[PDB]
Design a protein around this ligand. Structure first.
Ligand SMILES: Nc1nc2c(ncn2[C@@H]2O[C@H](COP(=O)(O)OP(=O)(O)NP(=O)(O)O)[C@@H](O)[C@H]2O)c(=O)[nH]1
Ligand SMILES: Nc1nc2c(ncn2[C@@H]2O[C@H](COP(=O)(O)OP(=O)(O)NP(=O)(O)O)[C@@H](O)[C@H]2O)c(=O)[nH]1
Ligand SMILES: *CCC(=O)Nc1ccc(S(=O)(=O)N2CCC[C@H]2C(=O)OC)cc1
Ligand SMILES: *CCC(=O)Nc1ccc(S(=O)(=O)N2CCC[C@H]2C(=O)OC)cc1
Ligand SMILES: [Mg+2]
Ligand SMILES: [Mg+2]
Lengths: 203, 206
């Protein structure tokens, strides 16, 4: 035991959903797989919820292991390309660190979140990035940096240039988001989709 | 139990090695992966160890979460046959229900399954039923190619599972059947080569 059966069958529910989804899309045109990561509480779930449903819940409900949201999107950079999105929402905790790290290998692009109001969020960005490229199934995976909780301008802590300096170092785009009001959330995600669908680089 | 934090060092050096391997397919002719599942103690790890290194260990070391052996192999099609170079990744799941999420998360990465049970353990035989439906709910394919192995055939004295009841189950599911023994290596090579045969003959008509 020491792992609720109610805790485990939820994850197997998440696991069963993903199997069906894949068996369907190899039975819209493309299927693109995003994964969100960051310290627990930086708003990974609150972001994907805000992006896919335009809703936000103030009450903290930590993500048990792994979940994903879906969303149908039309892509444009000319022509309309239709897309099903799989947005993997990893638990940010240590207890689930192995289970989340496992699904790092199913994502085409990663949204890496820190909470603007919490130094550690930012600090641990360094590690999360090199764990991203440790555990990725293609050597330069695409990452978009998200300073989340930009709506708390009254409690922000990370300097913006400090974050774009960290962003410019690794060659990664940076967005200050708020899951509360949707600021830049669509723009940051679409930008990751941009990055991904340009990686289809013919030769 | 919950995971030891040293049990999580282990599990993540494996994925380290796993991503490392996957990045070495673009950067073998075909990278073929299959996965071993079944109750704890059936011999999953021993069956792979016998196959990759012709060795065998008798003290039980239960697999911490997940591991995977590697083996390079020359696959020749079944009459005819030209040698293709297959790089095998042999996924080796733990059997304890307390890793079941983690091991189920890898049925994705698999192209085939070696479903195992213990010829000397009746309960692990009956659990197979459940293990198959788990492969039904979680394999990306479906009708995933499965090879059913009655491991531990070297212990004819301790045996409890009638051979008859086991072949029946097999053709009820239409899955090959093999009475293996990771101890003396009987059938260990022959069952795996059938999996690889079902698989490479399925990339066939992809
Ligand atoms: N003000 C504000 N609160 C936010 C924002 N995003 C999330 N929150 C709040 O902060 C908490 C953490 O958000 P949540 O999505 O649960 O974080 P998480 O990264 O998924 N945590 P975990 O990894 O444990 O599931 C919640 O109480 C949520 O309401 C935001 O942009 N602004
Ligand atoms: N005689 C005999 N013993 C075997 C055979 N296969 C495994 N065993 C023994 O029975 C035990 C099973 O070990 P193992 O191969 O790790 O089984 P497993 O299915 O991987 N167990 P787990 O899921 O817990 O890691 C060990 O003590 C091993 O020595 C076999 O074919 N013959
Ligand atoms: C740059 C490529 C990338 O970032 N991600 C990526 C990973 C995996 C896949 S996959 O669905 O084809 N896949 C590989 C092995 C099984 C499966 C998986 O990830 O297990 C869940 C596509 C893109
Ligand atoms: C039966 C289910 C299945 O085949 N899952 C699966 C997905 C991907 C891979 S893979 O790492 O080998 N891979 C990445 C690029 C090719 C692709 C592949 O194998 O062919 C689709 C393996 C297994
Ligand atoms: Mg969450
Ligand atoms: Mg084992």
């Amino acid at each position: 035991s020491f792992l609720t059966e109610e805790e485990q069958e939820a994850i197997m529910k998440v696991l069963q959903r993903d199997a069906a989804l894949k068996r369907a899309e190899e039975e819209y045109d493309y299927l693109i797989k995003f994964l969100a990561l960051g310290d627990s509480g930086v708003g990974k779930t609150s972001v994907l919820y805000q992006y896919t449903d335009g809703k936000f819940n103030s009450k903290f409900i930590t993500t048990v292991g792994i979940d994903f949201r879906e969303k149908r999107v039309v892509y444009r950079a000319g022509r309309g390309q239709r897309i099903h999105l799989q947005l993997w929402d990893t638990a940010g905790l240590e207890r689930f660190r192995s289970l989340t790290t496992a699904f790092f290998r199913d994502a085409m692009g990663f949204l890496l979140l820190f909470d603007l109001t919490n130094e550690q969020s930012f600090l641990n960005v360094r590690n999360w990035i090199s764990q991203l490229q440790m555990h990725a199934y293609c050597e330069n995976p695409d990452i978009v940096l998200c300073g989340n909780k930009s709506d708390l301008e009254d409690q922000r802590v990370v300097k913006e240039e400090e974050a774009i300096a960290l962003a410019e170092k690794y060659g990664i785009p940076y967005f200050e988001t708020s899951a509360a009001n949707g600021t830049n959330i669509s723009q940051a995600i679409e930008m990751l989709l941009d990055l991904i669908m340009k990686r289809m680089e013919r030769s």
